[PDB]
Amino acid sequence: DSVEKIVLELSGLSCHHCVARVKKALEEAGAKVEKVDLNEAVVAGNKEDVDKYIKAVEAAGYQAKLRSSAWS
């Protein structure tokens, strides 16, 4: 009868439990997770273990790509 603003909280369009999964995988890979959400993971680790961390995320069931400048 009355038209009102209604907010519905949604679940199933993103996987927050998968975030914890990526976190554990990175930690098991030796990284210290400083932050991790749906789109990125920020860790305190060894620059030489980058590929190692990426592999751990993939093995966990997701995709990861290093974000960096053109310089090595």
Next chain:
Amino acid sequence: GDSVEKIVLELSGLSCHHCVARVKKALEEAGAKVEKVDLNEAVVAGNKEDVDKYIKAVEAAGYQAKLRSSAWS
């Protein structure tokens, strides 16, 4: 004695933005006027009498919807 640095990795495989359109449509089909919809919420102009109808439409589209709580967090 190796060295610790901040390493940033871009992730993918944790979200479904392509899922949003059907949710919007299902809600409109249930009678709500959608103002905004993203991964975590759907904001609509609707009748509280039909809130259950809107929720069932989201579930039928394959997801879960819950009315925002005022009580906790």
